[PDB]
Design a protein around this ligand. Structure first.
Ligand SMILES: Cc1cc2nc3c(=O)[nH]c(=O)nc-3n(C[C@H](O)[C@H](O)[C@H](O)COP(=O)(O)OP(=O)(O)OC[C@H]3O[C@@H](n4cnc5c(N)ncnc54)[C@H](O)[C@@H]3O)c2cc1C
Ligand SMILES: Cc1cc2nc3c(=O)[nH]c(=O)nc-3n(C[C@H](O)[C@H](O)[C@H](O)COP(=O)(O)OP(=O)(O)OC[C@H]3O[C@@H](n4cnc5c(N)ncnc54)[C@H](O)[C@@H]3O)c2cc1C
Lengths: 482, 480, 482, 482
């Protein structure tokens, strides 16, 4: 066959499906996945087209982080034409994909200085380096916000051409554009990829059927590694992906109003963030908690919903307090164990992977789609996506020392973001007594690999058995690659 | 031919008792499976009698009568449950979720409510010779509060428990069908009557159903439906929406308490409680807010307040537990604070509504009462004051209500709990008294809304206040 | 006699004493007052040489306020030579009057946006209009501060040539400079001013003695009016002066360190402010609460000490938490009932008044001294200080409406400055329910006069009898002047 | 006559001085110490005559603790006659020593359940076992208190015949009674005790003089050991006494009122406690913080004053917020390194010690005085005070394991007593991460001795040099006694 199967019906699967169908009208492109989209990140995303807004001091302090940021800047440049090309297969009545053009980043004191002050400076620096249109503005000039004075921002940063989409209208427009270009939707799940003599044959589905193909693209979010790793000798060659459980909410505003821009903070403790994405029809999206879980989870915790609502009502708009909760949304950000995406070719001919995009995969989608389509066509794709090839040794983007400083900082930030009220001696006490146990965990896990902070905290508070299983995993990966 | 309008616990309870007692007569029950604004699905629910006692309630004749009826209702529940589970099988689930209740006293609230109400509960238990014990907090199973939010006193009440409201509704429907009842899943738009007699009910699909008996148990919609009939607009007390929020939570470890865990009733009939459920679930409730217009969704504030209280005052483990569902229902909130139970001036027209925050518990007693009246009996003796066609009851002086509304307002602060400069509470007490006194005087020379409704009126639009002055004036004309 | 008696040994008394003795070597100048300085504002002041730092939006919005600011800029220009002239009468071991040259103004969210944001903008505006040397700086570049992250500043403003003095070393240097110029210190209190046929004869002291003079200058701070008002028909001709009771503290720092600049916020609720003034020898000054009292009070309340210490440890330096409290200081800022100073001549020949300087009298002292000395010598003194003649109808600088908005704003600010944690509906509730009672008090007090906000809140929470006595006072003043 | 010198003018010195002068008309008794009473615990104490009020679960669980409680009950029986005998040397105008007969113990949730709930139960148990007159009462029936509802007590306990004295009037009555019985007050400090051939010769004073005597009693509070340890080979034979630095305050109440009983909580984190002791003349005493310091400190920290005032205004009476602060008091509770007093004879003939009474020495004073005076006369004194002889190996009353559990519990209690507001996961996190570092400190300090919790926390947060000096001290004590 020259037949192509895309495994997964999130934004990444459908984006790659659309680019393949449009570029090869000769070939049959079939996309698998069910309308339920169980643990789907895409439906739970607002979503922000985050590039400059996603900048942290920590990210920009590694080579691997500066490459990710560069790819996000490149992805930003594709969004206007990509949206035009998707709305062109529909009519006015289908709804607009774009919900805002611009973003305001707010700096308030409801957080750690060591994250929020460092990250605001890093965002300003990255905007100036990339010659992006932006302005530091008076907080008084930010429309709509009505924070608690004790939670108010004292600095604000307007970013032009960094906006948001309605993730639901984007999915509808992707499906529509996929069908329009000759794509076929088969609403079942893949259970197994079949390959022999180093070549893909096709995909077994969960109804027992077998679909033949010479090209399989895996974009099954957090299930992508488990699916490819079953193939011979790949178990320790594809980096593990965990579930980044994220909570968000849809709220009908007291008066039907909403902001004209995205409103956000910089990224906060363990990739949690506060943002408000505008929506049509008197709705706003608020997000977003993040927690790496070693097993999948389909429901918000009490703590996640309380923290999200408390931050939005104090830091963005007190009017949200009396506003109607329409929906609490939960999705799994695919969380790669080495903190970097899995994009491109495998050692198996015709087998491609598009996954581990964590908290910015929706934003990257048009760039990642174009990259994989160029590779499949004999091209080189996008420069700088080379380090993120799916079949690799675990990347070490930071020293153990840098990560141990980060995990303690982020731990303390869970306190300052609450915000807590404690005796002034207690924070220094906890900083000192956290360092030892995290240093001991990092040394015990592996001599060579260190999990990034988001994952290290989940491991710190996991069962002894789960820690032991990870020591074994890290050891098997060292054997395979050294 | 009997038509019951409404498919809540009250409608179905009366439907079941009619169908079982008069196999001769044809009983049709209206209402849709969606149960829009339905209180019953959002209730835990507690079989609250002693737990529902407040100092304020026990200080009026009307309050002492309500409490006595709640004690009487408690005695019916064991046989009523047995009679409803008997029409089903093991796989249908158990209606009863706990036999006993623990009342906790903590400092996350106003002394003027929580301390007074705990004493009142203890007093009422001793007066009724009810089996109970003040116990050491250390001996309360399961709870794991924040030390700063922990209880220092606890009260075990035997034979005051809880039901799964969802399994009760399923068992009522099933028992109704089994006794010959007919479920027609549409809403009533209009009651038809002429020459002082009910003819039947127009449905929202355009149809007309004839009957010589109509029982209105449509919760918070009950008055709006009967008040359309000639000269009844100012003879049936208004019912508003007591919007209540609760939640279903899957516990971190699948565990749950063996008893109900609760505080006494708090600001504006809000309360904190945990009702056990089967299958590693717990129910937590319950906020209350009187709204002049219906509302079908929880506010952010309601969800945050409910979750914050449960995680700090009951169990910190609930913080990491999975939210399965946020529930919203309308407690039917009668403008004079008392239920609407019994006959009208229109022959064959009965009303069963305005049961606010205890209607589920009362349901078997209220059902038996209305069925006895329909059969030519006298029903239950002290339900007489609550006949639906009446002048607005005045159970409290204006002065008592103005003290209550200021106390409850201050309690919204202490229940948060707030942290403010120590001069600010006394400042707010002084500056709240004037505006509430001015509102009560402006509303009517004779009627005073109870606190729960007065705060909703205080913060409503000028037009909504003016419409209520007109309503109160028209009721004075009609009855004096 | 040509003899001069100065009644009062605060900065104003001693400053005028020094300027009289130096300008008229012919005349005998005697200065009364005890070393205890009971209710003395001067010893309790840090003190800041505030000009740009004292700017508020409210001040810059009136003609009266723009004049006060201009006088403060003029006073600033006198301080270098005035200090040189006072240190010249001493030796190396006497210590330095000047403790800092520069001031950093900090903006944090531990307060009302309606005061702190407006006042920070007003300071920046006034600096730019005057072309005064200043820089908005990164908070990270502010030396020494170590705030609680949740209480930290996000903006900072360096003002060159706006500094501080040790008020205690200034008093010692003024006494010494007074003696050096021929002055006589008589350490007793005046009980009575004696006058007949419209001329001063002298002063009865509290030891029973009588001192004759043809010139008496009253600079007795908050006691100044009570002393002159006892003279015939003057009870309702000299505006009342109340006690602005202010609390500050001297702290020995954990490590002997201190900041090189003044550190301050803009003025806050009811003229409270948060500041740290450097001192020699491992000490710092922290201030300063303000509360108008209708009766004098010589001791700090619990609330004042807790509020002062809580603000300094959270907003300036957590190290102050473990630092040793050396002294709690209480002084009476002389609070004139119409909000303007009492400077110059009376209807009684040879009777002068120098008082009602509230919260800036130390900074103004060299200008106010020179002004009164020029008037006594037949000159015109400083232009624009003529409006503040002590014998006057109560000035009305603000509409009743402006004052009622101010008092409600400042009342709400006591909450945000705490800072309080409240349900989000409660602040709007309190704003609404405060308006009525303050409007009712203003109407009941007088048809013509309105007390400024700082005094109105003290009257609101005073006894019924004290309110009634003020209605009578305001009525008697209307009779006297209309 | 034979010469006796008492070194120290606290309650213990003067109590022993009074009993010697009255009992031994043969001997000439001179008592040293200045009216300043530098670091004096006695002037800073309220003070409560604590017996049942001082009971904790920890105390009642050891033989040593049940003995201390029994001695406190015995001391209580002496107070009525002792007061009668001291007031008899004065007149009506000298003031009453006794300020209350009864005590109310309050239980609120502003603290750790593991201390406050356990201690309230232990007090109730001890009262019932002794058949002591007491009643658990309704909180509504407690006179005077007006707490913040969120900080209010939910249980209260009236104890009859457990009261309080004005420590200042007790000191004045002791001095007066000492003079009346033939005692001599020499207001200077001892610098050195002189001894040769194993016998005391006398005392060198800080004015250079030498006073001869055959009997010297050291009751210099926290200076007692430093003074005796200078004598040959005694540096490691007399257990070190550190400074239990305690802060209290005198407050003039808003309305001149006060409670008729002592109002207290049980003892809280590191022997801090909250109490109100009635005083004459519209004053109340509030206390009392406690912190073991390795060096003396004569001034309150900001933290201590804020914590004391915050607890009293919220938990006892909101009226104290607007009340006038008259005095912040600091004293050194003599804190023995092994947690037991130093009472009786040394290896040096005529050298006695009466010290290390920490937080209950004022209550014990008449019993301890009678004991030492009986020993000096050839008697046996009080049975069970013999084990507290000053020249001893450090006592080990508690396992290392018991102390490590206590220090973690008390550390957590500093949080709950604040009270803090934190995310709900944080307290369990802090409990886990505190255990290791305290266990590591205890192991490193000595193989044999473990400091009690109050001292262990001070050592944990001391300088490396101070920890090393204590390892050396503990090692030298092991050498000396094994
Ligand atoms: C959050 C919450 C918690 C509570 N907890 C408790 C508790 O623990 N214990 C307790 O005893 N009580 C509790 N209550 C109170 C109790 O739920 C109510 O008092 C009682 O259930 C009211 O019953 P009802 O049948 O009158 O009303 P509902 O349950 O509201 O039933 C009325 C029904 O009529 C239907 N309807 C409306 N209009 C029409 C129409 N035109 N035609 C046909 N049908 C119509 C509605 O859809 C609805 O299903 C609680 C209430 C709330 C809100
Ligand atoms: C804040 C606080 C509250 C307390 N509350 C209570 C309570 O309610 N009830 C209770 O029973 N106990 C209480 N105590 C404990 C009690 O105060 C002490 O146990 C007791 O006062 C110790 O008496 P003392 O005479 O040994 O020491 P101190 O009272 O310290 O007296 C020692 C004296 O010796 C002097 N001195 C020092 N060096 C020399 C020298 N070289 N020569 C001469 N004199 C010297 C000192 O200046 C001082 O005056 C409290 C303690 C504090 C600090």
């Amino acid at each position: 066959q020259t037949d192509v199967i895309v495994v997964g019906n999130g934004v990444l699967g459908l984006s790659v499906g659309v680019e393949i169908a449009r570029t090869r009208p000769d070939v049959r492109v079939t996309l698998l996945g069910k309308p339920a989209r169980q643990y789907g990140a895409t439906p739970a995303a607002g979503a922000m087209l985050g590039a400059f807004g996603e900048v942290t001091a920590h990210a920009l302090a590694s080579e691997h982080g500066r490459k990710k940021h560069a790819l996000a800047v490149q992805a930003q440049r594709l969004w206007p034409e990509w949206i035009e090309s998707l709305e062109a297969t529909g009519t006015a009545a289908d709804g607009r994909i774009k919900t805002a053009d611009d973003t305001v980043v707010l700096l308030n004191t409801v957080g750690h200085s060591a994250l929020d002050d460092a990250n605001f400076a890093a965002v300003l620096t990255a905007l100036k380096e990339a010659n992006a249109p932006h302005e530091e503005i008076a907080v008084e000039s930010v429309d709509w916000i009505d924070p608690d004075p004790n939670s108010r921002p004292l600095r604000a940063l307007h970013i032009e051409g960094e906006g948001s989409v309605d993730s639901g209208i984007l999915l509808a427009a992707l499906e529509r554009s996929f069908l329009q270009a000759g794509g076929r939707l088969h609403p079942v799940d893949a259970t197994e990829i079949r390959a022999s003599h180093g070549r893909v044959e096709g995909v077994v589905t969960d109804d027992g059927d077998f679909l033949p193909a010479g090209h399989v693209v895996v974009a099954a979010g957090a299930r992508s590694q488990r699916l490819v790793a079953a193939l011979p000798g790949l178990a320790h060659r594809i980096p593990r992906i965990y579930d980044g459980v994220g909570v968000s909410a849809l709220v009908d505003t007291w008066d039907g109003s909403g902001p004209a821009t995205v409103l956000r903070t910089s990224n906060r403790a363990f990739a949690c963030g506060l943002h408000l994405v505008p929506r049509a029809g008197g709705s706003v999206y608020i997000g977003a908690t993040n927690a790496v879980c070693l097993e999948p989870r389909g429901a918000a915790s009490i703590e996640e919903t309380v923290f999200l609502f408390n931050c939005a009502t104090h830091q963005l708009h007190r009017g949200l307090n009396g506003s109607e909760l329409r929906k609490v949304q939960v999705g799994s950000a695919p969380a790669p164990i080495d903190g970097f995406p899995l994009i491109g070719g495998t050692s198996v001919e015709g087998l491609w992977m598009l996954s581990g995009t964590y908290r910015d995969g929706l934003h990257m989608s048009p760039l990642l789609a174009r990259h994989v389509v160029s590779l499949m066509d004999g091209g080189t794709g996008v420069d700088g996506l080379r380090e993120f090839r799916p079949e690799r040794d675990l990347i070490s983007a930071w020293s153990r020392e840098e990560i141990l400083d980060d995990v303690v900082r982020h731990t303390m930030a869970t306190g300052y973001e609450f915000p807590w009220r404690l005796p002034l001696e207690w924070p220094h006490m906890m900083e000192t007594f956290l360092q030892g146990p995290f240093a001991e965990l990092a040394d015990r896990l592996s001599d060579t690999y260190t999990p990034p902070a988001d994952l290290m905290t989940a491991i710190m508070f996991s069962e002894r058995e789960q820690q032991d299983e990870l020591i074994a995993y890290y050891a098997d990966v060292h054997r395979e690659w050294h």
